[PDB]
UniProtKB/Swiss-Prot annotation, chain A:
Protein name: Large ribosomal subunit protein uL18
Lineage: Eukaryota, Metazoa, Chordata, Craniata, Vertebrata
Listed PANTHER family: LARGE RIBOSOMAL SUBUNIT PROTEIN UL18, RIBOSOMAL PROTEIN L5-RELATED
InterPro entries referenced in this protein's UniProt entry, alphabetically: Rbsml_uL18_euk (IPR005485), Ribosomal_uL18_C_euk (IPR025607)
Stated role: Component of the ribosome, a large ribonucleoprotein complex responsible for the synthesis of proteins in the cell. The small ribosomal subunit (SSU) binds messenger RNAs (mRNAs) and translates the encoded message by selecting cognate aminoacyl-transfer RNA (tRNA) molecules. The large subunit (LSU) contains the ribosomal catalytic site termed the peptidyl transferase center (PTC), which catalyzes the formation of peptide bonds, thereby polymerizing the amino acids delivered by tRNAs into a polypeptide chain.
Biased composition (Basic residues): 256-266
Record-listed Phosphothreonine modification sites: 230
Chief place where the protein resides: cytoplasm
Originating species: Oryctolagus cuniculus (Rabbit)
UniProtKB/Swiss-Prot annotation, chain C:
Species this chain originates from: Oryctolagus cuniculus (Rabbit)
Compositionally skewed regions (Basic and acidic residues) per UniProt: 111-122, 135-144
Name of the protein: Large ribosomal subunit protein eL21
Gene field: RPL21
UniProt record similarity statement: Belongs to the eukaryotic ribosomal protein eL21 family.
Annotated PROSITE patterns: RIBOSOMAL_L21E
UniProtKB/Swiss-Prot annotation, chain D:
Subunit (UniProt): Component of the large ribosomal subunit. Mature ribosomes consist of a small (40S) and a large (60S) subunit. The 40S subunit contains about 33 different proteins and 1 molecule of RNA (18S). The 60S subunit contains about 49 different proteins and 3 molecules of RNA (28S, 5.8S and 5S).
Annotated GO CC locations: cytosolic large ribosomal subunit
Keywords: Citrullination, Cytoplasm, Developmental protein, Isopeptide bond, Ribonucleoprotein, Ribosomal protein, Ubl conjugation
Protein name: Large ribosomal subunit protein uL16
Role description: Component of the large ribosomal subunit. Plays a role in the formation of actively translating ribosomes. May play a role in the embryonic brain development.
Top-level taxon of origin: Eukaryota
Portion of the parent chain present: 73 to 214 of 214
Post-translational modification: Citrullinated by PADI4. Ufmylated by UFL1.
Cross-link (Glycyl lysine isopeptide (Lys-Gly) (interchain with G-Cter in SUMO2)): 94
Keyword Ribonucleoprotein annotated: yes
Subcellular location: Cytoplasm
Protein's gene: RPL10
Any one GO molecular-function label of the UniProt entry: structural constituent of ribosome
Length: 292, 169, 159, 133
RNA sequence: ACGCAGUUUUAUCCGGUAAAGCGAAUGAUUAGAGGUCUUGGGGCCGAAACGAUCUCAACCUAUUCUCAAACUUUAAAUGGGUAAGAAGCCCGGCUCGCUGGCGUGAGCCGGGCGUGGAAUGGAGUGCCUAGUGGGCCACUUUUGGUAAGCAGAACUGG
RNA sequence: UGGGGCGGUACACCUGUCAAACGGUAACGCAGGUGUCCUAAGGCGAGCUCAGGGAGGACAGAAACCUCCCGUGGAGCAGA
RNA sequence: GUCUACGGCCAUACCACCCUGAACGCGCCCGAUCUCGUCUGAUCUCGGAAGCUAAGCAGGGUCGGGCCUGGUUAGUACUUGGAUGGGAGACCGCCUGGGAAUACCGGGUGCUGUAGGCUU
């Protein structure tokens, strides 16, 4: 008919890829450049912060590498903001800001230097670059792993970068992929950036709809009705959460015990059984011809 | 039942090949843009051929692709031209079909004197939810055989939605 | 008469083995190469920068310098009777630590201990390797059975 | 072939040759002398190892001695010392005769042409369903 | 009393030659069973067709006979390189424009701890310096050639 | 320079093999190449997939153009 | 018992087709004002949360193809050193030491490090 292509020979020759590329999760080309440290430092680690976005949540981590697997030292998840007041809007540009700021302040507390290195206590959306003062221990410095995402203009990855930089970390960057930047003129605004952070875009869209039409409004922003939030307090809402993070960022865990030990999954079949199916199968097939 | 196993139209493709490169192609462009509401794009040869009369890297054809509810309208118009009668021999093993029109004027469109007549080709691509994952750059997969489409399934869809007519071959 | 190219006769050496082409598994990079370490060499041809000459493929050496991406190595070489020492700069992905001393290291540490502890006893016990000696007069049992009896077999023109 | 025809018949046998001439021979023709010596490919030839096989015949048992007589006429065409033997196998197969006949009446061996086809107990059962039916 | 060695041992790396393989890649090649796959027939029973029916240059599936200095999944024997302790191990403290969450690294100082597998024998270092710079044979491996007391090479010994 | 001359360049260079599994190793020994070409065919970043094979689509045919599926590199990377 | 983020070793983890998936998750999914890019909000970016295990993913099954590893092949083929051993030669045998690969027959079919959830 037509030649088969996936045959015995195909598989003998074949060569598989590393596991995370087949899953589709990792780019070893770029991971090489990042993680490896120069060979004249010998154990001085190269911390990178990680930022990933799901469909419903945001994860930010800091990590360094070894032979055995990447070590983690501090993490922050955007689903524990209601402990700080924010109830909804957990995937937008703004939650990224609060997410990063939480992360920084938690990090600094563990080392010990949360008294100093406070960054912008008053948000302005300008360009701020932290400085490591003298007589005091050096500032933390790390790098950014975006991943597979595109770094076009206005992602929710750079909205997390700023929370950490305004929180007190030292990171190199540049003001091209912040919102408030004109390609046609190559200038930065530094107030539009502030709008995106406080959520006034969302307010504009809600007020736009409540005027125009109400069915689509209830369909688009149902869960802003539950918890009865409105466009009139967004700016105060996040502005209070920021101060809450700056006050009590320490984390606590959740113990649970005495689980009933139920197996919700089927185990593997053993050899004796596998040899017993085929015999009784052969039996049935023979019997059905003596049936005739 | 079948809550998320329900067919639709992914996209509708529209192609016109001429042979030449110039005014005919420009006229042919204005056609498609008027039928869809959006600019088409011009397509270039791959390698040169003598008897057909063409060189390499010269614009020949023009195509465009539509999506949404506009597709259903244009397909509806095209089938009124076709009297809703198709053959089994126009369906494929992937769950897709297509056909071709010899004159565009039957669609309910005027005749500009500045523009002659033209033909064109429709090709319809079916689908159902959970096919974006194949082009998805984040974590790409393959969809599975219980969820793929057949030559036969497309027939009964066409029989059902329009009371079309399959013909022998 | 042969030529003088730098890769003459390397069709197979600077060639990746079977079903192991591709990107580089990068625990190779994350290793730590300090001064005085003993190292062996093996040219990976997947990357061409900093690879050594044919003559050093399969030789062992010793570190003297450390750069950002490479290492300096002291290697001996036999050329017409006299032997020479040589200082080749080499990038990381062509090297590997050598287990050719860890055995020595297990001993001296075990040996230091085993001296210090069990010193109060008074006996100077064995501390140093000995070769394989002869083999220990002992008995053999015939638990009943007489042995088997073997003999040769007739020839046959089986093919 | 000639004798074997004249003895048994036109169809009482099947004969096969088990060598192929893959190696080449060079010749230097001296119509300079010994300068620029590398020959021209005149010829083809085949190599032999000890124990290899050159010729084989397949026929019935009442025609044993005629088979021997045929090959004996052939050895005088070769440069060397050869010898003849009967095989324990069945035909041009690789199975012992005493086992073959029982082993085909039990669905391990199938006669697919001029040869057979062995089949083990590992594949998928649909081939065990097709057989035994 | 250290140091050495056309040597063995214990650990540990390097290689792609012999052999083998082609139901595994590249390339070559024989024969018949299930495929008119399928293009056409000196033609074929016929108006001929994919009605049949063959086939052929090739051609799908499972098997089959034979091959490789410039092919190879596999893979030796002999071989080559390191290591087998005082230039080692441990304790404590100092200096640094180098690197920096804090830290690493290298260098200097001051103390505590001697046999480190076999079998052998005296080692090291520096000046002046002649004659040579036509080669030949034997086992084994080996290239051209019909061969050579022929021409050209690797190993050891003469 | 298997006497010299006529022929060739083995007279400076590169790949594979011969070459006897480190390296090195000869003959007018085998098979081939060079005295160039490039403002990008150099350098950074981003995005994508090659050869071919199958099934469909107005003129369209062995081959123009459109779409889907399989596709471990069976394509390309100036030249041996 | 199991998932999410980051990974190391890279088929005991791949390929095809069938069964099941509580809770948390992961995804599908609904739109295009502003950010952003498209011939086309299909991909990419943004704002969302009505519904869903159909798919992806997770586990499991195949007298499954391949892969990993044993046995047999076989002390066979080959091989260091040796002989005033045989033989017309080609080549063969022996002493002293080392020692393979196919066919064929069996078994196995992912291990884990750091941080954090569900399993009251
Ligand atoms: Mg990138
Ligand atoms: Mg070689
Ligand atoms: Mg051989
Ligand atoms: Mg002199
Ligand atoms: Mg002269
Ligand atoms: Mg050699
Ligand atoms: Mg959408
Ligand atoms: Mg599912
Ligand atoms: Mg299901
Ligand atoms: Mg199996």
């Amino acid at each position: 008919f037509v030649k088969v292509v996936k045959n015995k020979a195909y598989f003998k020759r074949y060569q598989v890829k590393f596991r995370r590329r087949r899953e589709g999760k990792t780019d070893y080309y770029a991971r090489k450049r990042l993680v490896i440290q120069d060979k004249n430092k010998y154990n001085t680690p190269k911390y990178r912060m990680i930022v990933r976005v799901t469909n419903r949540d945001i994860i930010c981590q800091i990590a360094y590498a070894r032979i055995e697997g990447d070590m983690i030292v501090c993490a922050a998840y955007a689903h524990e903001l209601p402990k700080y007041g924010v109830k909804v809007g957990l995937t937008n540009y703004a939650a990224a800001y609060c997410t990063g700021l939480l992360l920084a302040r938690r990090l600094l507390n563990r080392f010990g230097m949360d008294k100093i290195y406070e960054g912008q206590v008053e948000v302005t959306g300008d360009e701020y670059n932290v400085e490591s003062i003298d007589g005091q221990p050096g500032a933390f410095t790390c790098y950014l792993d975006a991943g597979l995402a595109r770094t076009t203009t206005g992602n929710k990855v750079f909205g997390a970068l700023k929370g950490a930089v305004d929180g007190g970390l030292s990171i190199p960057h540049s003001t091209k992929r912040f919102p408030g930047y004109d390609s046609e003129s190559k200038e930065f605004n530094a107030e539009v950036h502030r709008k995106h952070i406080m959520g006034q875009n969302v307010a504009d869209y809600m007020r736009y709809l409540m005027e125009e039409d109400e069915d689509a409004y209830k369909k688009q922003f149902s869960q802003y009705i539950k918890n009865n939030v409105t466009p009139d307090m967004m700016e105060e809402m996040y502005k209070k959460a920021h101060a809450a993070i700056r006050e009590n960022p320490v984390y606590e865990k959740k113990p649970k015990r005495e689980v009933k030990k139920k197996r919700w999954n089927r185990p593997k079949m053993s050899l004796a059984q596998k040899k017993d199916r085929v015999a009784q199968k052969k039996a049935s097939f023979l019997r059905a011809q003596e049936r005739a | 039942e079948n809550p998320m196993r329900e067919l639709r139209i992914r996209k509708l493709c529209l192609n016109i090949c001429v042979g030449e490169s110039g005014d005919r192609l420009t006229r042919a462009a204005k056609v498609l843009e008027q039928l869809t509401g959006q600019t088409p794009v011009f397509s270039k040869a791959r390698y040169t051929v003598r008897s057909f009369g063409i060189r390499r890297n010269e614009k020949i054809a023009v195509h465009c692709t539509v999506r949404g509810a506009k597709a259903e309208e244009i397909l509806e118009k095209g089938l009124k031209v076709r009297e809703y009668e198709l053959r089994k021999n126009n369906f494929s093993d992937t769950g897709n079909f297509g056909f071709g029109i010899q004159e565009h004027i039957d669609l309910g469109i005027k005749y500009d004197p500045s523009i002659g007549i033209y033909g064109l080709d429709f090709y319809v691509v079916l689908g159902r939810p959970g096919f974006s994952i194949a082009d998805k750059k984040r974590r790409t997969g393959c969809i599975g055989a219980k969820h793929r489409i057949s030559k036969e399934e497309a027939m009964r869809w066409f029989q059902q939605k329009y009371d079309g007519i399959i013909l022998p071959g | 008469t042969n030529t003088k190219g730098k890769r003459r006769g390397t069709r197979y050496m600077f060639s990746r083995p079977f079903r192991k082409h591709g990107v580089v598994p990068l625990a190779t990079y994350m290793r730590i190469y300090k001064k005085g370490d003993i190292v062996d060499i093996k040219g990976m041809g997947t990357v061409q920068k900093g690879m050594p000459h044919k003559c050093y493929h399969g030789k062992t050496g010793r570190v003297y310098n450390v750069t950002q991406h490479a290492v300096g190595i002291v290697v001996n070489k036999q050329v017409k009777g006299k032997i020479l020492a040589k200082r080749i700069n080499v990038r990381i992905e062509h090297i590997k630590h050598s287990k050719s001393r860890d055995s020595f290291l297990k001993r001296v540490k075990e040996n230091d201990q085993k001296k210090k502890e069990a010193k109060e006893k008074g006996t100077w016990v064995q501390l140093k390797r000995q070769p394989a000696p002869p083999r220990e007069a002992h008995f053999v049992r015939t638990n009943g059975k007489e042995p088997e009896l073997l003999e040769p077999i007739p020839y046959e023109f089986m093919a | 072939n000639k004798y074997m025809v004249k003895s048994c018949g036109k169809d009482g046998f099947h004969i096969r040759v088990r060598l192929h001439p893959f190696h080449v021979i060079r010749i230097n023709k001296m119509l300079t002398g010994m300068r620029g010596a590398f020959g021209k490919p005149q010829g083809t030839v085949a190599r032999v190892h000890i124990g290899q096989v050159i010729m084989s015949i397949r026929t019935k048992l009442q025609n044993k001695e005629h088979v021997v007589e045929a090959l004996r006429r052939a050895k005088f065409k070769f440069p060397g010392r050869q010898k003849i033997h009967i095989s324990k196998k069945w035909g041009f197969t690789k199975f012992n005769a005493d086992e073959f006949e029982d082993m085909v009446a039990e669905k391990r061996l199938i006669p697919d042409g001029c040869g057979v086809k062995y089949i083990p107990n590992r594949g998928p059962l649909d081939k065990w369903r097709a057989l035994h039916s």
